Design a protein around this ligand. Structure first.
Ligand SMILES: [Mg+2]
Ligand SMILES: [Mg+2]
Ligand SMILES: [Zn+2]
Ligand SMILES: [Zn+2]
Ligand SMILES: [Zn+2]
Lengths: 16, 286, 253
RNA sequence: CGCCGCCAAGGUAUGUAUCAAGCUUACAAGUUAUGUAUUUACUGACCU
RNA sequence: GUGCUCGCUUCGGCAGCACAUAUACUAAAAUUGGAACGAUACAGAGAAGAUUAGCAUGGCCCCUGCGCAAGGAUGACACGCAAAUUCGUGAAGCG
């Protein structure tokens, strides 16, 4: 797609 | 600047022999596009065939999934322009020499040193394929690509060798129909050929043929799969499935959506791994 | 020959400015004036690559990143705008203006929870007071009671400023917070200022307690005087404390 | 008791738009004014 | 193809043994893009007056030279961007 894929771990916070 | 171990080599340039001998070099010829020192390899495909050493380098073949020496695709056996016209994304590359060409070429070689297994941009869009390009996908191709080019002194009648001249003879070429993107002269006629195929002659009335005789059901086609494949086209008025002939009857309100189904199912609608049988319904209350 | 003169003018300007950026690869005015000259054409797919290869020689400057971000914000493309804003703010965390203008673009956008994720990342880098009370004003301008209370517990443990000690007692002047106002006043009395009072907290404490009834207003100003600073007060406010106690009571004979 | 044997760059500039041979793959292929001390300019085809 | 062995029954026919797959395939090309130099015509020659020794910095400019010497007009190309001093607009916040 145009936007990149959102990487969030299983338990914690949103990863950048 | 470039070393290699083994090139791409689609099957129509390998020859008819699984046993070929090949010699290699460390720094051979320049590419005819970007002049990069690849490794030219030389082999003999057949006993009546020329050598067909190497046309381009490895890196420019790794951009667009192109074979090594005749500049066709590896995944089908088609040119590049048909492939990115059928997929509608070109993956642009410059034309000049030092403007932006070797810059992005060296950078795309630099970012592709890890994989060496898949192209840089075609990995995501070579999956949604086999719909429009499977119709012209030639199996067991003609070996006339491998035959040597035409020699002189038979055109003028001076050839002292006679039969032992290895190239060709008695082939008058034609100066009416013979690079990387465009333009290719017989390929335009090939697109006209795939645009001028042989469908059924359209009968001259106002879209009254809303029924259609599709069959070849067996045990793969079911009623809910067919009505959901018709649901993306539109809504039904009266559908049925008959099992004494393994067939299905569908109609539409204002014909046009089913019309592109007539574009979709002229021995072309391939679901559940079968070439379905389609001929015309009555639309006459007969 | 209108197209010939048009392409000749554009090609001469592009060639001159590409020779200018080829000569000097340090000063960044040339790339941004060239790219805003292409932005004047209003239809570009090449100026993003110009800003992208212009940050490779200098990514530590604020001006190029903010100008390309405001250029992409000026156009209607928001997805590529977010795709350059997030890498800008994760590249330079310590600057404030990128986060400010991205959150202001989100002020122009909706109030979705991704904005709150941006604001909690903006809390995570430990900025100064100017960011944090701006974010609590952001929480006030959408009328949030529970979440603004939630984000404000981590506020005091970083900055022990008296301007923040008196404004940790703000739910008194917002919700009146009674039992937890007594708990917040316990928090105002047990922490730093154990023997010197920081000469300002008990003023606002007695101010709100005079705004309240006569529960515990006699104890703090005159009877809790163990924590004095050599006179318990300057000359400027002691009689003001006395008249602050006098004429705002039950007024018995 | 008998050294030593000399070339060149340093100077008659070089940046352009057309017109062949040299070399290169032979391949991918379907405020006027006066008097004077005093310069600066101007004229007479002024003059050995 | 060639030599040897009656080895099998005619010197001749047969059989076995040994030798074991080269070539940028062309004398050509319908040919291919044709850059240097020379010729034509322009523009013309560093350093705030004139003639000018030069040595340098850069990279998408090269040449002569065996060059980690050197010389090519200092080998050529190097230009207006004032930044914060005054004022206007907009945003974030505080009393
Ligand atoms: Mg020099
Ligand atoms: Mg110089
Ligand atoms: Zn190449
Ligand atoms: Zn091939
Ligand atoms: Zn011949």
């Amino acid at each position: 797609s145009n936007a990149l894929a959102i990487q969030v771990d299983s338990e914690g916070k949103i990863k950048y | 600047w470039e070393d290699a171990d083994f090139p791409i080599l689609c099957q129509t340039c390998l020859g008819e022999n699984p046993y070929i001998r090949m010699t290699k070099e460390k720094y051979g010829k320049e590419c005819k596009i970007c002049a990069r020192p690849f490794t030219v390899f030389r082999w003999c495909p057949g006993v009546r065939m020329r050598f067909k050493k190497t046309e381009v380098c490895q890196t420019c073949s790794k951009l667009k999934n192109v074979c090594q020496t005749c500049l066709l695709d590896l995944e089908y056996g088609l040119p590049i322009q048909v492939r990115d016209a059928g997929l509608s994304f070109k993956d642009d590359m410059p034309k000049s020499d030092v403007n932006k060409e070797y810059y992005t070429q060296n950078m795309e070689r630099e970012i592709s040193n890890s994989d060496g297994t898949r192209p840089v941009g075609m990995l995501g869009k070579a999956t949604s394929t086999s719909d429009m390009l499977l119709k012209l996908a030639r199996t067991t191709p003609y070996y006339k690509r491998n035959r040597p080019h035409i020699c002189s002194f038979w055109v003028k009648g001076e050839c002292k060798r006679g039969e032992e001249c290895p190239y060709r003879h008695e082939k008058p070429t034609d100066p009416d129909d013979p690079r990387y993107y465009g333009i290719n002269d017989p390929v335009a006629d090939k697109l006209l050929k795939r645009a001028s195929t042989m469908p059924r002659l359209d009968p001259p009335e106002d879209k009254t043929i809303t029924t259609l005789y599709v069959g070849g059901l067996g045990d793969t086609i079911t009623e809910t799969d067919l009505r959901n494949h018709f649901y993306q086209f539109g809504e039904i008025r009266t559908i049925t499935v008959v099992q004494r002939q393994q067939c299905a009857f569908i109609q539409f309100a204002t014909r046009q959506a089913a019309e592109v189904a007539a574009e979709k199912s002229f021995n072309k609608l391939i679901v559940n791994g079968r070439r379905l049988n389609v001929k015309w319904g009555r639309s006459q209350a007969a | 020959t209108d197209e010939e003169e048009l392409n000749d003018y554009k090609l001469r300007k592009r060639k001159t400015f590409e020779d200018n950026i080829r000569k000097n690869r340090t000063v960044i005015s040339n790339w941004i004036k060239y790219a805003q000259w292409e932005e004047s054409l209003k239809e570009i797919q090449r100026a993003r690559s110009i800003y992208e290869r212009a940050l490779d020689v200098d990514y530590r400057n604020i001006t190029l990143w903010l100008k390309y971000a405001e250029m992409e914000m000026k156009n209607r493309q928001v997805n590529h705008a977010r795709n350059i804003w997030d890498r800008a703010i994760t590249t330079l965390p310590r600057v404030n203006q990128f986060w400010y203008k991205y959150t202001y673009m989100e002020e122009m956008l909706g109030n979705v929870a991704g904005a709150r994720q941006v604001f909690e990342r903006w809390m995570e880098w430990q900025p100064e007071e100017q960011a944090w009370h701006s974010y609590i004003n952001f929480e006030l301008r959408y009328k949030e009671v529970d979440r603004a209370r939630t984000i404000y517990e981590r506020f005091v443990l970083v900055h022990p400023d008296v301007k923040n000690w008196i404004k940790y007692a703000r739910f008194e002047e917002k919700h009146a917070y009674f039992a937890h106002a007594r708990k917040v006043y316990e928090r105002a009395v047990e922490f730093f200022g154990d023997e010197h009072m920081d000469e300002h907290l008990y003023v606002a404490f007695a101010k709100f307690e005079e705004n309240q009834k006569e529960f515990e207003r006699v104890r703090v100003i005159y009877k809790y005087a163990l924590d004095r600073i050599s006179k318990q007060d300057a000359q400027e406010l002691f009689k003001n404390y006395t008249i602050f106690e006098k004429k705002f009571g039950d007024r018995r004979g």
